[PDB]
Each structure stands twice: as C-alpha cells, then as structure tokens.
From Swiss-Prot, chain A:
This is Tip attachment protein J. Disulfide bonds: none annotated. It is found in: Virion; Host cytoplasm. Belongs to the Caudoviricetes tip attachment protein J family. It comes from the Viruses. The chain holds residues 100 to 148 of 1132 of the full protein. Interacts with host LamB. Attaches the virion to the host receptor LamB, inducing viral DNA ejection. During tail assembly, initiates distal tail tip assembly by interacting with gpI, gpL and gpK. During virus entry to host cell, binds strongly to host LamB in an irreversible attachment. The binding induces structural changes in the tail leading to viral DNA injection through LamB trimeric pore.
Amino acid sequence: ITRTITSANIDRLRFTFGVQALVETTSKGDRNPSEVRLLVQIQRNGGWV
Amino acid sequence: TVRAVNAWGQQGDPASVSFRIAAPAAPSRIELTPGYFQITATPHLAVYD
Amino acid sequence: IRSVNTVGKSAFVEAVGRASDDAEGYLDFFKGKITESHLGKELLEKVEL
Amino acid sequence: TVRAVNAWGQQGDPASVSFRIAAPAAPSRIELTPGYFQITATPHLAVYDPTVQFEFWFSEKQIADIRQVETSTRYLGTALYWIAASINIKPGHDYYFYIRSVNTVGKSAFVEAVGRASDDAEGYLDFFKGKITESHLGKELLEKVEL
C-alpha cells in the first residue's frame, strides 16, 4: 500500500490493521480458523526492513 | 446504539450498528428418491443452517 | 416443504415425487421361490388338470 | 484457578482445578438389522451421551483407508439411527456404513460396520400366499398356459 506520511512532529506510529472475515467454510457446513499473516515494514533509507 | 460514559456519568457521542433477523431461506434443491410404494424426500438449502 | 425454525417459517416449495415403477428389480429377488401355493386357486385347479 | 480476596482487595493464595472437554466416544456396538431391500443401522455407545448424534456414510464397497470416508463415500446424514433403502440396494451384496459420533464439541473417529439385506424371500412370499390369481404372470406363461 504505502502512504509516505513524512510528518514533522511524530513520536510513535500505530497501525490499525485487521481482517474482514476469518471463517473456513467446508461442504455440508461448519467453520474453522484461517491463519492470516501480515507484515509491517519501514522505509529505512533504501532497504525495507 | 452504544455510548461511552466516564467516571462522572457523562455519556459520549453514540455509535450505531445495524443487523437483521429473518426467516430461514427456502430449500434450494429437493432429492426425491423412489422406492417400494414409498418416496423419500430430502431438501437441501444453498447455505447450511 | 418449507424451512422452519424458532425465528419463523419460510415460503413453501413444491416438489413432485414418483414411486419406483421398477418392479423387475424387486422381482429379481423373488427368483425361484414361488413354488406352488402362492398362485390363485383358479390357476391351481387349471394347472392340476 | 480461584483466589480469595478480602474487603481490602488483597487476593489470597490460588487454588487450582483441572478438567477436559473432548470429542464423544466412537460407537461401540452397531445393530444392522436387515429388511426388504433395506438396512437399518442403529449405533450404540458404551456410555450414553445426551448431546451426541451419529453421522452415517454409505459405501457400496469397502475402502482400504478409513480416512477417505469424507471423499470416497456418500454422506447419508446425521441421526440416532438410519434406514437405507433404494433400488440400488439389492439383497445378496454387502454394503458398508461408516458412522461416527458427532456433537457441538467435535467429531469422533469413524467406525465401519458391514450390513446385509434380508435375503429371506420365503418369509415375504408367505404373505403372497394364494393371491396372484392369473394376470401377474408374464405374457409368455399366459399364452403357454392357455393352450
């Protein structure tokens, strides 16, 4: 995504992420977890660490 | 509608959500197997309830 | 047939069912077992002659 | 873990207890009564679990692995007992029922029970005694008999 905040008087950054749904439906019904994974990275000059 | 109140009992601005409760969906498909002077009817919904 | 639960009842769905109409499949199980006495009396008396 | 607190909010030493919630036990004894082109399967449990039901799956033939039931067999349904009756069911051929105990907590391991039809034609034909009069016979026998 990236947004280039480039503010001046910031101290800490808080990210509000999430998932719209997490069910794992199967045939005939029922549901199970889903194992979603996300990653938050910083610019750090040239290398996104 | 949910409102927040502080230690002095002052409620905050309301936040609203909406939902619905409706009758279940009608059966999608019908399996009518025949037999000896008998009929076995099994309905199935598009989404399991 | 209509989907019903505690919340309410759904609209009806009409399904047309028929019997087996496959007598021969059941007669195959009847193979070689009707010996003499199952036949009607008219055939019994005619056959005895 | 339960702790006691006095009027000043000071919690005391903890006391602990442990328990478990597991899937219901698999069915122990299965009664497969036969009938006219039909098989009635009634599973049973060593100990009765009010909340339990049984998933019945049908297979016209056996499978080497009992873990393929969810794909290699036809899921008959869920009940306390199941009756299977169709023209595809014929006496003299064995069938298999993969049944497992299920409830809200979870599903038990499958148990396979082999069922057979009645294969007792004479008992049913006794009810056919002296009643097939003339017209049920095939046309070939009708014309042969009339001569």
